[PDB]
C-alpha cells in the first residue's frame, strides 16, 4: 500500500531508457558501419529493449489494476523471455571486457590474425545458451503451462546463481589483467574500468540475487526488497547505452 512511488520511478526510468535503446539501434543498424566492437553493443541494446519493454508492461498492468477496476492476467512465458533478456545482457558485458583485455595484451594478433565472424559466432552461441537455460528453468518451475517439482526449480536457480558468479569473476579478472599490463609498461582508462565494474555489480546483481537465492535461503518483505531490485536493474539497463556508445562518440 506504500509502493506506488517505486512503480513511478520504474516507469520513468524505463521510459527514459527506451529512447536511448531505440536511437542506438537505429544508428548501429544500417546508418553506420560495424567493427568487432559494435556487434556486442547491438546485442546488448536489443536485450535492454526487451527487458525494459516487459518491465513497462508489468508496471502498466499494476497501475491499471490499482487505479481502476480493470484487472488483467498474463502467462509466464513473458517472464521466461524477460529472464532470457536479463541473462543475455549480463553475458554481453563480460564478453566486451574479455575482448578489451585480448586487444590490449596481443595487439598484432588482434589486428592481423583475428577471424571476421567470431563476434557473431559468440553472440549467437551466448543467446542460444541463455534461452536454453531460461526455458529449462521455466518449464520445471511452473511458469509454463504445466506443473513440476520444487527441488528442480531450486537447483536450476542455484546453477543460474553460479553462472552469475562466474560472469562476475571473468569481468574482474579481465579488468585486473588489462590494468596491470598497462601499468607495468590514463585517467580515462581508470574511470572506464572503475565505473564499469561498480555499475555492473551494484546495479545488475541485486535482481538475480533476490530472485534466485534469498527466496529459498531465508512473505512480507516482498514489497521491501523487490521494487528496489527492479529499480536498480532498470537503472543499469537504461544507463548502459550512455556508457558504451554515447560517451565514445564525443
Amino acid at each position: 500500500k506504500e509502493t506506488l512511488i517505486p512503480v513511478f520511478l520504474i516507469l520513468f526510468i524505463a521510459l527514459v531508457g527506451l529512447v536511448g535503446n531505440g536511437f542506438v539501434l537505429w544508428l548501429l543498424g544500417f546508418r553506420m558501419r560495424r567493427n568487432a566492437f559494435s556487434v556486442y553493443v547491438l546485442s546488448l541494446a536489443g536485450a535492454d529493449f526487451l527487458f525494459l519493454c516487459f518491465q513497462i508492461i508489468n508496471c502498466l498492468v499494476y497501475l491499471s489494476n490499482f487505479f481502476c477496476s480493470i484487472s488483467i492476467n498474463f502467462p509466464s512465458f513473458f517472464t521466461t523471455v524477460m529472464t532470457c533478456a536479463y541473462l543475455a545482457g549480463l553475458s554481453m558485458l563480460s564478453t566486451v571486457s574479455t575482448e578489451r583485455c585480448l586487444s590490449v595484451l596481443w595487439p598484432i594478433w588482434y589486428r592481423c590474425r583475428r577471424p571476421r565472424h567470431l563476434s557473431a559466432v559468440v553472440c549467437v552461441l551466448l543467446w542460444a545458451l541463455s534461452l536454453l537455460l531460461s526455458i529449462l528453468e521455466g518449464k520445471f518451475c511452473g511458469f509454463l503451462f504445466s506443473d513440476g517439482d520444487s527441488g528442480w526449480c531450486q537447483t536450476f536457480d542455484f546453477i543460474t546463481a553460479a553462472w552469475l558468479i562466474f560472469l562476475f569473476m571473468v569481468l574482474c579478472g579481465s579488468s585486473l589483467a588489462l590494468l596491470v599490463r598497462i601499468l607495468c609498461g590514463l585517467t580515462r582508462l581508470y574511470l572506464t574500468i572503475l565505473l564499469t565494474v561498480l555499475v555492473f555489480l551494484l546495479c545488475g546483481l541485486p535482481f538475480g540475487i533476490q530472485w534466485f537465492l534469498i527466496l529459498w535461503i531465508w512473505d512480507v518483505l516482498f514489497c521491501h526488497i523487490h521494487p528496489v531490485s527492479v529499480v536498480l536493474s532498470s537503472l543499469n539497463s537504461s544507463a548502459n547505452p550512455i556508457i558504451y556508445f554515447f560517451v565514445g562518440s564525443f
Binding site: V61, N65, S76, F143, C153
Partner: peptide
C-alpha cells in the same frame, strides 16, 4: 514459485 505480475 512466484509471479511478479501483481
Amino acid at each position: 514459485k512466484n509471479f511478479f505480475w501483481k
